[PDB]
Amino acid sequence: VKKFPEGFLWGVATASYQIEGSPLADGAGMSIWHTFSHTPGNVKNGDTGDVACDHYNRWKEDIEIIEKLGVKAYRFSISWPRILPEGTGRVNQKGLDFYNRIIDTLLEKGITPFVTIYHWDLPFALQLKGGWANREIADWFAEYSRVLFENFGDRVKNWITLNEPWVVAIVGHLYGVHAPGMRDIYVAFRAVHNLLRAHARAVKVFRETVKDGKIGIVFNNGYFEPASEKEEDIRAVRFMHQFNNYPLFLNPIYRGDYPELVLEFAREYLPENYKDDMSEIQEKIDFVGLNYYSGHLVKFDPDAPAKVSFVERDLPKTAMGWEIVPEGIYWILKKVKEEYNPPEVYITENGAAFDDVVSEDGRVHDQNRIDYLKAHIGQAWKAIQEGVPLKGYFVWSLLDNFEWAEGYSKRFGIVYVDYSTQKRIVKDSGYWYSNVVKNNGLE
Amino acid sequence: VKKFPEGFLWGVATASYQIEGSPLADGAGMSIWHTFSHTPGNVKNGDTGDVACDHYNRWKEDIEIIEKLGVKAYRFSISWPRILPEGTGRVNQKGLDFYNRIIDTLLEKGITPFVTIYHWDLPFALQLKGGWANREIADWFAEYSRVLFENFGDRVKNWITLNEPWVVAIVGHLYGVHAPGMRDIYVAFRAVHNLLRAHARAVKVFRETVKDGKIGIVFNNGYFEPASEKEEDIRAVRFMHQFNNYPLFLNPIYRGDYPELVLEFAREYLPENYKDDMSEIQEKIDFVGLNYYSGHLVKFDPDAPAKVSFVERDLPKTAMGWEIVPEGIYWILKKVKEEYNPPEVYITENGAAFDDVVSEDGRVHDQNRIDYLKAHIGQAWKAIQEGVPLKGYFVWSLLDNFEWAEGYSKRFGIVYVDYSTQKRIVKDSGYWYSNVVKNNGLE
Ligand SMILES: OC[C@H]1c2[nH]cnc2[C@H](O)[C@@H](O)[C@@H]1O
Ligand SMILES: [Cl-]
Ligand code: NA
DSSP states (O other): OEEEEOEEEEEEOHHHHHOOOOOTTGOOOOOOHHHHHHHHHEEEEOOOSSTTTTOOOHHHHHHHHHHHHOEEEEEEOOHHHHTTTTTOOOOOOOHHHHHHHHHHHHHHHTTEEEEEEESSOBHHHTTTTTTTSSTTTHHHHHHHHHHHHHHHHHTEEEEEEOOOOHIIIIIHHHHHTTTTOOOOOHHHHHHHHHHHHHHHHHHHHHHHHOTTOOOEEEEEEEEESSSOOOHHHHHHHHHHHHHSSTTHHHIIIIISSSSSHHHHHHHGSSEEEOOOGGGHHHHOOOOOEEEEEEEEEEEOOOSTTTTHHHHHHOOBTTTTTOOOOOOHHHHHHHHHHHHOSSSSEEEEEEOOOOOOOOTTTTTOOOOHHHHHHHHHHHHHHHHHHTOEEEEEEEOOBOOOOOGGGGGGGOOOOOOOETTTTEEEEEEEHHHHHHHHHTTEEEE | OEOOOTTEEEEEEHHHHHHHHTGGGGGOOOOOHHHHHHHHHHHGGGOOSSSSTHHHHHHHHHHHHHHHHHHOOEEEEOOHHOOOOSSSSOOOOOHHHHHHHHHHHHHHHOEEEEEEEEOOOHHHHHTTTTTGGGGTTHHHHHHHHHHHHHHHHTOOOEEEEEEOOOIIIIIITSSSTTTTOOOOOHHHHHHOOOOOHHHHHHHHHHHHHTTTEEEEEEEEEEEEEEESOOHHHHHHHHHHHHSTTTTHHHHHOOOOOOOOOHHHHHHSSSSGGGGGGHHHHHHHOOOEEEEEEEEEEEOOOOTSSSSSSEEESSSSSSOOOOOTHHHHHHHHHHHHHHHHHOOOOEEEEOOOOOOOOOTTSSOOOOOHHHHHHHHHHHHHHHHHHTTTOOOEEEEOOOOOOOGGGGGOOOOSEEEEEEEETTTEEEOOOHHHHHHHHTTEEOO
16 A cells, blocks of 8 residues: 555656647748658658547547546646747747636646646747747747646646757757757757746746746656676766756756766867856746656777667667566656756656557456556655655646657557547556545555 | 850859868858768768868968969859857958958959859858748848958859859758758748848849949759650759749749749748748849759659659769759759849859879879860850850869768869869860860860
């Protein structure tokens, strides 16, 4: 028996471009994911977000699902180009109306909204002006964030500025695998820095406009272990933690500079006078969100672009090929407390992709996903018993959805979506979780 | 005996990033090729332009080689970020000094300068603002063009706005193979359109600042043949010529719209209201520069993104793998005259790469280059006999150099460059072309 604290927020999470469809409905502007996915070669099977789960139409049914499961919080994101179709300037009332209905409905039903301001769907109009590479995006983002705060901050009290800024910068602008699809290391590090500046401006505006709520930021994290007892493998782990995990961003926020090994690798790629922006970057935050999915074995490697390579292990893997390592969620939670001691932490995503099928009996028997979720929830509980101020846990995802460059080929939902009909079928993992939430823990 | 007209201009061509090195010397700003080539994985063997042929230091010698060969014209480019390190604003006097000495030396030796304003080295500062994706670049480019015209137009009277805008837009922003290394088709077509707009602004500034000068624009061209006499393959060739060759830009400049089959493919990717800019785009030009290297055989194919695929042929190939089809230079010259009838045409680049070796003799016996060039210059002569107003021919290139994503692995020079010592060794093609210029023709 593992009972969580009284009032612990059990949640589910989604993102706008992944679930909504109808990207150009009701006067919305194009996003960078619209243009990226519509470019041949960028997304598996030529898939796009044009339809997705059709949540733009089916949002009431989906929230009724969350309500029927008894889940207490819903993390969702707002599409910037539905709100400001050119990124700045004109506000689109029909976009505000879409999200107003969702927010009013969740509150009617007693579900706490957690709003992600940016989950990767930058307005295309801003990408034409350099997007995250342009210092002026700190102003654009702050203006966007102020619109949201002024329209929704009377009702929404839990806000997240950025989802996984490492991904946005590095996968988007170095690896070129995500929108906007660039491969330039100097751009990617300018994006890292502008992401921090934009985050901080939005937190500054939040303090002026929503006197009652809390604001934070979300990071991707892996559990890196060293391949050997060699000092060089241990240091490769230190580097991957500092670069790929929360320290890239929390070292600036809490300490006023990038982590040491990131500076060793990337000083030449940051702006020349980047320290001039650090005092502003330290704007106080209310909580940290940590996403966690996987662990990696890591070794020093002289021929790799950052002197690190991954070493495959014969461990159970998900359909993404990602190693299942539940102790990682404990470790990152312990480690964030030890390194930065944030006042609150949330697991804002944890989940798994498996090759789900609808059985003859009408059900989806995803015991593999139950097992994954139960183990990570247990490790989260552990960290709570050892003093980490974990206030909530959000499953990625409510719904099978558009998995970015993998398209529809990877199902992370606790609810199966049959894309030919848009039918929703609650998976065994969804039923299992509803019981966890009702009991406030595991048994 | 193939004699060319009186005053026919015989030339050699280079580009700034490809030969200069010292990209950050003397207060120069970074270019997108510096940042792109310093990104791992973008250029073969990790080559960069940091050093190249060290023309930044060895320029006098190189011009003396042009003199010793009696070549009458030198086509070279100006590095935008040497002149305006932030793209706009402050002029770097040292960058002005560098090209002024080159310009003064050429004139003293009676070599006619053809200056390329843009040969792909955009200032990094402007890439952070969206580069060619940003409508604003028409103003940035106009400002830059003015600085060049005001400081250099007293002596340079032959100017090219853009080298190969198809490559800049499509290879830099759709294929991601060139700087800035993006893959987004909406961005790529906005870059096509902004290239035209920036070109036209520069020509308008040129008319206000240079007395008795000529200005034109350079296009890449291939000679496309159908794989069969089937209707669909003939229509595939028509699409390739309209999109990949001069019509993409010349249809706007002479007829005030893009070609029909380009619009059938790409109307959804072009900016809203693009046709509003077409009357400005028709700013009158003085010449068309055509670059020509190779031929390709193509076929219709309902699975390729543009419904077209290339098909390999068992013909003589260069070290790049490109099929040697000299009759393509005649075809492209005849076709530009029939379709657009420009008042003057130049072959602004023609050339080949072969695995060139230095022998015990300390000479390089590149018969293969001689054969390539001789065949093309003869097809150019034939075009002149059928009334094409061809005024000059430029060999790509004077020096072996940094061949973009191929790095130093591909040698196009009529002068060999030993990168270990920076030793120039004139090749036999060099001596053979020396002859051609002397005789104003072949044999
Ligand atoms: O690849 C060889 C050359 C070429 N071929 C077609 N266009 C060009 C460019 O203008 C030039 O800089 C390249 O070095
Ligand atoms: Cl900037
Ligand atoms: Na107009």
